[PDB]
Amino acid sequence: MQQLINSLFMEAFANPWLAEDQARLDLAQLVAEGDRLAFSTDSYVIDPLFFPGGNIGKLAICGTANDVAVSGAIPRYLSCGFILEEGLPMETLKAVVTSMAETARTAGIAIVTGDTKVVQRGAADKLFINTAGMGAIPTNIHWGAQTLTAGDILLVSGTLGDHGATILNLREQLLVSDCAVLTPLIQTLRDIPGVKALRDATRGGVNAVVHEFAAACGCGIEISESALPVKPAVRGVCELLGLDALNFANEGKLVIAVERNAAEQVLAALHSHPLGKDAALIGEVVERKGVRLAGLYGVKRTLDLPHAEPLPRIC
Amino acid sequence: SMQQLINSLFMEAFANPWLAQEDQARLDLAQLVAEGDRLAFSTDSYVIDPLFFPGGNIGKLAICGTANDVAVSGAIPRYLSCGFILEEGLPMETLKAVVTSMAETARTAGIAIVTGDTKVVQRGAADKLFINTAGMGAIPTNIHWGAQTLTAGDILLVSGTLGDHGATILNLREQLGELVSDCAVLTPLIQTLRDIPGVKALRDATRGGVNAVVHEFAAACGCGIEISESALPVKPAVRGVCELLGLDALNFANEGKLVIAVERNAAEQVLAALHSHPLGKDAALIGEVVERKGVRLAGLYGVKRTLDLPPLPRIC
């Protein structure tokens, strides 16, 4: 039972680093790419496991790879921890692991170490995955929210809330997830000097990222409600539940802060890549502290982080 | 409010200069390279039932296991990542006790928890709490420990008694005072062998106990390994379990034991280095690396028999 499941992982993720108790990585290689090591981890508990536009496996690579890539580092090595409910169909596990392998393979990421734990029926819901990941940040890239000052422009790299809306629609039964590895989109920005901060916008959406930006740099942020790009179908969920696309989780979207003079250059670079096409300016960094949303007639109102807890297991 | 409260607990409990961050931790690479030429990188998920046991808990466990997986290479564990999976309506006092234990263990071991994640699921979707940790350290250039290197004549040591953790958990789940888990960070024990040239291979013996390690050792080198049954150090309370269940202390998970492979002429030197440390004290010679392939256990009258790989879920 165990080394049958264990056999699938070795087979699927086969690489020189997997072939004892840990992986062993060339450190000189890393230092030659950059002075800092980006290191991130995420758990994935998405219900259901498969959905329009992806699955838990692809998601598990994407999310962690993105958390690394957003620093400017190219993700290189990934760890992978599985928790399985006993009696999970092999067909399901196989398709999950396959998607993980091919997603990592396409992104040039090696899954270098791992673990598998099996619990009894009812102790876990089907399958949970943890991944941790790393890359070297190049010495000359200095992306961080602490660097933001009044005048900086906020951009978003595509429509807001596709993923959350897609999972909400499936589970409440009323749309395609954007789930993607963002490293190719991000490297387009690598050469552009006016880029100042980059975040992906998962749990808590761009609302959370924007409040995090404001607290990191000690400046206010003002956002134009009508400038928010939202697909009609996502707008549909918004109309029906009153929820805010600013709060929905995204699995392939960036929030980017740039020097004012560089907004056009950055947008045009975003628009020239497939991931990509729906990028938009949405707001700016201002002197007056706090996060505000501009509505009808240019009225600026405090944007609060949501009261209520989101539907569980959207990621 | 609850996700902010949970996150509030992690940020305060683990607070350190690397967590203070956006989507990732940022680690000085020059400092790692000055320490070693290779980065040891490991991960483990922890799903133990129950959460609290004589000698530790899921929280302490999550630091020790991953730290040891790193330290077993020769590296000093430096940085840990940490993902929690919480069942909705898990009592705060329980979470708080677990997180407190983790933080204290990481702190005692000189380890920073530099990044993390937290996911909550509905009632029924998880059993209380699962933790994944991942960890790294730099492996000093002059330490080349691995089983691939083993050859006939090499001596097999174990650093202490066998089966403490496994038996402790079995007893609780199956209701059979004397049993305590060996749960510990082994870094200070490992650094004791750091300079000893005769050390060739080193592993912890968690899932599948030492039986598994010895088999992996045998597979890695192209040789057989022979274990002496009477040489095996087993606490009386563990023998008590073996006697009742008929299960093998060689198969029981350990959470604070090393299986060590040394050159014959280093055996006694390594025993003394082990014996001088608390962790430490019950180290014993248990076997040999031989030419004839296979894993064998020597029983009565020195009869060598093939030792097969064989378990209760959620022991780790």
Side-chain angles (χ1 to χ4, degrees), chain A residues 2-3 20-28 30-31 34-43 45 67-68 70-71 77-83 112-115 117-120 122-125 128 130 132-134 136-137 143-146 171 197-200 203 213 305-307 309 312-313 315, chain B residues 1-4 21-30 32-33 36-45 47 69-70 72-73 79-85 114-122 124-127 130 132 134-136 138-139 145-147 173 201-204 207 217 309 313-314 316:
Chain A
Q2 178 68 43
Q3 276 174 303
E20 278 174 320
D21 280 323
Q22 74 289 124
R24 293 176 185 201
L25 310 165
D26 195 309
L27 224 25
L30 292 164
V31 50
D35 62 343
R36 295 152 288 157
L37 185 63
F39 179 46
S40 192
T41 193
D42 262 295
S43 297
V45 298
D67 284 7
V68 165
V70 126
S71 76
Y77 310 120
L78 202 135
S79 79
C80 177
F82 286 89
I83 298 168
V112 302
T113 198
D115 192 52
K117 292 282 183 293
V118 176
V119 293
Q120 51 275 305
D125 187 16
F128 302 146
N130 184 282
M134 67 179 82
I137 318 180
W143 296 339
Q146 282 191 248
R171 280 175 73 190
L198 226 99
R199 275 266 214 160
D200 50 27
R203 171 208 52 255
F213 274 4
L305 291 168
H307 32 78
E309 222 51 70
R313 310 182 61 189
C315 315
Chain B
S1 181
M2 201 79 72
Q3 205 91 22
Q4 296 166 315
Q21 93 173 36
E22 300 152 348
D23 291 329
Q24 73 293 123
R26 292 178 194 205
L27 310 165
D28 184 291
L29 219 31
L32 286 163
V33 68
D37 73 335
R38 289 153 296 154
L39 193 69
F41 179 51
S42 193
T43 190
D44 233 282
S45 291
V47 295
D69 275 342
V70 169
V72 132
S73 72
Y79 308 121
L80 264 255
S81 78
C82 166
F84 281 81
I85 297 177
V114 300
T115 198
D117 196 50
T118 285
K119 298 280 186 286
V120 170
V121 297
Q122 53 271 308
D127 192 16
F130 308 139
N132 183 281
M136 70 186 74
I139 308 176
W145 296 336
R173 307 253 257 104
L202 216 97
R203 279 236 207 181
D204 47 43
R207 169 184 194 42
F217 277 11
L309 296 171
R314 302 186 58 187
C316 326

Side-chain angles (χ1 to χ4, degrees), chain B residues 10-314:
Chain B
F10 297 102
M11 289 302 154
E12 273 286 59
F14 300 141
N16 72 63
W18 296 271
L19 254 202
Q21 93 173 36
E22 300 152 348
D23 291 329
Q24 73 293 123
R26 292 178 194 205
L27 310 165
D28 184 291
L29 219 31
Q31 270 172 44
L32 286 163
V33 68
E35 217 173 336
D37 73 335
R38 289 153 296 154
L39 193 69
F41 179 51
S42 193
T43 190
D44 233 282
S45 291
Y46 303 90
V47 295
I48 191 165
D49 176 56
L51 295 192
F52 284 91
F53 46 92
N57 60 77
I58 195 168
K60 187 172 167 208
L61 183 57
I63 305 296
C64 301
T66 296
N68 297 340
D69 275 342
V70 169
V72 132
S73 72
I76 286 153
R78 211 100 259 180
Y79 308 121
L80 264 255
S81 78
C82 166
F84 281 81
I85 297 177
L86 275 54
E87 181 188 23
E88 260 268 336
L90 173 83
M92 275 306 313
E93 46 260 56
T94 308
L95 219 210
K96 210 159 273 175
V98 166
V99 168
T100 284
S101 199
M102 271 191 91
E104 126 82 25
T105 309
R107 200 153 59 242
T108 317
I111 304 175
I113 297 153
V114 300
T115 198
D117 196 50
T118 285
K119 298 280 186 286
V120 170
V121 297
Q122 53 271 308
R123 294 179 172 85
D127 192 16
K128 298 174 180 86
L129 215 204
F130 308 139
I131 310 167
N132 183 281
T133 63
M136 70 186 74
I139 308 176
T141 302
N142 69 4
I143 301 191
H144 303 289
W145 296 336
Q148 280 206 272
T149 187
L150 304 188
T151 62
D154 292 342
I155 289 291
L156 228 94
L157 301 201
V158 85
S159 68
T161 51
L162 298 190
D164 308 17
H165 181 81
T168 301
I169 304 314
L170 274 149
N171 178 63
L172 281 160
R173 307 253 257 104
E174 291 168 308
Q175 287 108 117
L176 316 163
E178 321 93 331
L179 286 159
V180 167
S181 178
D182 58 357
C183 205
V185 176
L186 306 182
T187 313
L189 225 214
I190 293 151
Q191 297 301 304
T192 251
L193 322 154
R194 181 214 172 74
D195 291 343
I196 306 171
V199 182
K200 282 177 83 177
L202 216 97
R203 279 236 207 181
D204 47 43
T206 55
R207 169 184 194 42
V210 341
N211 193 359
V213 169
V214 157
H215 275 83
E216 291 151 13
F217 277 11
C221 72
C223 306
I225 286 157
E226 302 182 345
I227 291 168
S228 175
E229 195 189 6
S230 61
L232 297 171
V234 187
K235 294 223 221 309
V238 180
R239 304 175 182 194
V241 167
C242 288
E243 218 98 32
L244 201 70
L245 277 323
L247 297 176
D248 194 348
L250 286 167
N251 296 330
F252 288 165
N254 300 280
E255 287 304 343
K257 299 297 142 55
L258 305 171
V259 183
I260 310 168
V262 302
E263 272 161 338
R264 172 162 257 106
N265 303 320
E268 293 308 311
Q269 186 198 338
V270 171
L271 263 187
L274 259 26
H275 280 342
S276 69
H277 195 275
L279 280 174
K281 56 155 187 146
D282 299 314
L285 193 154
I286 66 155
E288 283 201 41
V289 178
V290 297
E291 185 178 36
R292 171 150 89 100
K293 282 178 157 72
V295 181
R296 272 156 271 118
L297 181 77
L300 261 34
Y301 329 119
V303 172
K304 274 104 99 115
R305 299 183 177 97
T306 312
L307 212 205
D308 286 310
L309 296 171
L312 197 82
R314 302 186 58 187

Side-chain angles (χ1 to χ4, degrees), chain A residues 266-279:
Chain A
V266 169
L267 227 221
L270 263 15
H271 287 344
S272 85
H273 185 270
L275 295 175
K277 284 97 75 185
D278 306 305

Side-chain angles (χ1 to χ4, degrees), chain A residues 23 31 40 51 62 128 141 160 175 221 244-245 272:
Chain A
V31 50
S40 192
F51 50 88
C62 289
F128 302 146
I141 298 174
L160 313 192
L175 280 170
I221 286 178
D244 191 342
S272 85

